Amino acid sequence: DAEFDEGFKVPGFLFKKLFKYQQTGVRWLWELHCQQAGGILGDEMGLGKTIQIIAFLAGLSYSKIRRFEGLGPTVIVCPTTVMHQWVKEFHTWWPPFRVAILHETGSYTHKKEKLIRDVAHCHGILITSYSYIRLMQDDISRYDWHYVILDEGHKIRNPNAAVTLACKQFRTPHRIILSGSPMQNNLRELWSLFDFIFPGKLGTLPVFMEQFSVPITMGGYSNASPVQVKTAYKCACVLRDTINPYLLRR
């Protein structure tokens, strides 16, 4: 087995399967756990973020760390096309997990609220979609989930979409975002993502916009004077420093 700083072991076979950067990522996820912070697995598409997440969750269940003993009831919110991709990857990589789908397709065939209840009370992985998170926040948030992995979490990039407000209703500290592109049109999207994983770091959207978005943007227009370019460089350095501990982007 591979052992990390405090009590976190990941099985030797599960660990051997991973690559060097994926196990760096499993480490990084677990320091996030130790500090009770969220973060953005920003490794770009195809590098394997499902596997780092599954390996970390498996080592979280396997290490029996101490409220929840090991892994609690976690929710994975993903685009509708990959819910079954997630189920497949969980069943091949860590079969002991109970991985339910919260969808019409699903596999349950009873009241969905019953599925959410059962997964909350048997510490399963509930795989749902962003649409369902919007529609069933009344039920999805009455159960004190242990992790709130959002796959392709850049669907949270609009701070005012209903999905965004919904996903920001989980009381848990262990929020994770999987998105190889956690910035798509502007810095407001980055603020929204970081406001999900760690609400305070970037300030209120007032402060973030005035301190970072207007400066960092205004130094990229072609006509930008040198002074304003240098301000943009300075503010970009500050922003990268601020978000360094919580973004892992290979």
Add this chain to the structure above:
Amino acid sequence: MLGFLSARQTGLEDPLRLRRAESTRRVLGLELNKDRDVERIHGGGINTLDIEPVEGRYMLSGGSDGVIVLYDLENSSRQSYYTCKAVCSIGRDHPDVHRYSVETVQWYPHDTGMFTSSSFDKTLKVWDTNTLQTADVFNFEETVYSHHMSPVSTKHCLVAVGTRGPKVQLCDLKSGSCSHILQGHRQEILAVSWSPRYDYILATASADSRVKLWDVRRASGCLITLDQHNGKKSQAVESANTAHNGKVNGLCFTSDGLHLLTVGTDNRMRLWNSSNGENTLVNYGKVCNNSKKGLKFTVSCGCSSEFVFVPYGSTIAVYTVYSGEQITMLKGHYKTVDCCVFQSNFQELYSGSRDCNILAWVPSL
């Protein structure tokens, strides 16, 4: 004293015994030293004092006139009488001088070369001691009541800043990041203090009668909200769990960092368990404060019994932390006392006041 010397020399008692019992004797004998004076440089009331943690030689002072004074507390003259001369001063002609009252000044822990000061001009300025020029300025939208650097953080260099805003600003001196905010208070934060024990534990006290303990690493809000009664009056937390029945304008961790002392405008001082925020029910009597800003008070260190020196109107009231028994009240100021700071090497106290004086209290004999 001769019994103590004989017991030390012969090994009966650990030398720690003599150190602590004698330091306690020196604290009980603390009295206004007219055999030491501090040079008057402030045109306004002294709001804050900070003796450097390493070597305890130099003192900072922030006045209501916006000047910062840097004093030498070592008696470099061969006389038994000396005045603590003012080495430096950020004066009315200094281009970086604060435009309004300096409400807090703090040495950088771990090194004397940098110190930080916050003002009602809505700035926290970082100063390089040697060149005495600002290295950084953190502008805030609202006037600063109190800032504090962790006395312990070998890892992070965050400054917790409390302004009239309901949020606590965390400013990273390492690459300048003033975006982090701790939200959960509802009124002006009148006092902030990092735990001396835990690198990332911050205690914040606000005019809404609430004191909160935070883990600035954590992404899930305040750890603890101090409650007077510990559950006797229990309510779904929307307005209850107040530390005081007024504004809480002073915070001070005990030396070992296992307890928290709060003073509020209910004319009370309370002692709390800093791990679970449980009131220890130490009485302390009545502590007259009606300060409308942060009230800086200190504790003793390395004595047989710990003490707390709290500004009590124009006097400095000395209490035993863990029994509440008021040792005494040091009366030598002419107006209300704003701040006291303890020199832990010689059990000396310095106290500033609105009467534009800084008085040294040294043990008698």
Add this chain to the structure above:
Amino acid sequence: MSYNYVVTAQKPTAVNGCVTGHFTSAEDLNLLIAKNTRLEIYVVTAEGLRPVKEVGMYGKIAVMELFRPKGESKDLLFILTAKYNACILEYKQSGESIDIITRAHGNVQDRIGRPSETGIIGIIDPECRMIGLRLYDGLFKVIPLDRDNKELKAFNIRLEELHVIDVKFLYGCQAPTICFVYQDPQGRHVKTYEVSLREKEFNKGPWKQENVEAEASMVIAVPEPFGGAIIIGQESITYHNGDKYLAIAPPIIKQSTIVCHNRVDPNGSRYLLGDMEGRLFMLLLEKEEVTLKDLRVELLGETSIAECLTYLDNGVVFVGSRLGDSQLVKLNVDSNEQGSYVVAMETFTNLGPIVDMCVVDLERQGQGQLVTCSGAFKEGSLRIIRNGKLHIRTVPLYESPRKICYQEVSQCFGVLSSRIEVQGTTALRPSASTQALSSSVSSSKLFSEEVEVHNLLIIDQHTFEVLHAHQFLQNEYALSLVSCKLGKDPNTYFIVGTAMVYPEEAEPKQGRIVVFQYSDGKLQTVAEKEVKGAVYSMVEFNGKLLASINSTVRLYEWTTEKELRTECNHYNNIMALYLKTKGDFILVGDLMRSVLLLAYKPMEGNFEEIARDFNPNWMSAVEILDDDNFLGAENAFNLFVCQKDSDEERQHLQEVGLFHLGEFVNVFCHGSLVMPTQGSVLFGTVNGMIGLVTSLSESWYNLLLDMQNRLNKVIKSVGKIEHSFWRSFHTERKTEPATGFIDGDLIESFLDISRPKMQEVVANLTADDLIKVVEELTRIH
């Protein structure tokens, strides 16, 4: 920078802790003795003790306890160091070779914490599930053992009681259960907690808090048949098992406090209890069929003042004393016709608290010869030390010696002694003051439970018999004592500085300087001088008497009338405790301002504060090495050398030397015990170490520092402690690496290693050169 070489002339002799167990083998019964930095392993033979190993820890052994984890063949040893180096050591004998392997180690110092008043406690669960350490107020550190560490990861449990006197692990409990006495304003109480290593926190103990005697200071965990605990206070011994409350108040234990204990049996039917007077008691538990019926205390006899005591077997008890010689006594079944069952089998020399010492070239040789005030109340004595190894004579004084000076012209030693009288008053025992040839008492016109009587003993420097004993006034404490000739008259005087000690005050306001002359077997009082404070120190200073009354250092002159007349004063001191002299310069060691270089400018007739060290070091002793190098000893077991630097910053002494000795220096003195190095300063410590500081040149200092680093890279310490960490200057508010000081012990260990290890040392420097160097270095002591 200063270049100083520290070495041990006499290793510490005071036994600060001793345990018994099966450490070297499952069948051996070992006696492990902690003298401050030395761990001495003996085998309990049918007669005496056979030494098997003596190791040097890089640490003051604060805790030392043997424990046997499940499956282990023989006892492992847990040691905690004063600097909080924890280690678990195992003894592995491979034929001739002997090793002490470190089964685990770590540093458990909390960065912050108020180190507890009563001092470092270290207990081990009777089932070896955890090591409980009370190091700081309000915290209780737990080192798990079931989670088999190699780094000793430990966690704090917050203890709701902040003033814990003593704590033990109870027996016969499914959970690790601690029982401790703590003091709150409402009195002293005994409380129990159950330790949860899984929850990492306390739980409600088996039996709730109980209000106990006011001076309850000892907890004794009692083995499984009885269970419970026995709390010893001053006037009572009480037994708690949760529902049972036995309580006795034996009148025989009221006279002195019980300070150490030991379980004679495995079943705890008998305990030894040692008190500060040196009495030895046997506490008997009478069982009922099993419950406990009643407690009995019987006085076995007297021993040396025990710090620790251990019952070995067959009535043999090792009484490890810090204040007197350690003892190996026998407990007879029948009394000795004097009421005593204790019979001393063997005595182990202990240069006890060395409170003062002098180097006299007695026998008119070229050899120095230490004479030290060793020991304390009943164990006080003069020890005479000389090379021949070191031979140690003992002159039992039977009372605490305090100072000693040699008057050569008169062929005598003047010794300040102190004896404790009870009632007007009565001597508890015949003390060397009371058996002098002649005697006298101070009849002075200046000033008009148990008390301390102080005498000036004139002792023959051939026979070491008390030629004379002058008792000082009632409630007069003699502190300082100098032998010298003053002014221009030719008589050599014994000058004693005293203080008047009344319980109504914390610092004496009254005292006097008495000038005696010893001639014709009598001690005449030649002069007196009422001073307004305690005379902590007097040095003869260029024909004049330089005394230090409470906070003033003043210089007296000896007038033609033969009286002391003040010449100058100096006041900028908290407490001038230590005075030294070299030429016109006076070094003042303060209670807490630490050193001051004063100059008597004779052209004016007043003092001048030349330089000062502004660091807050609480001195225990001071010395002048050179014109500008000032050795000092802080009460945190550190040596530092100050140096007059090279404006007003010239009034700042520069601390150019720093070194953690691990011993409490009580005295420095120039001299050498022998017939490359410059100067030679001996020092005597509380533990009984005699060490030697001397000045090196820059070249050799560099060489020896290089080889120090090499030996650190090669020699492996017992608890895997780093030498640099051990010698690092340490105070509760400061910590710096050593500098300007070479551990002569580590250097001299360069001989006790095999030749391949030597080449490992001597890679880039030949070896035989350094063998010559280190031999020449050992020549100095």
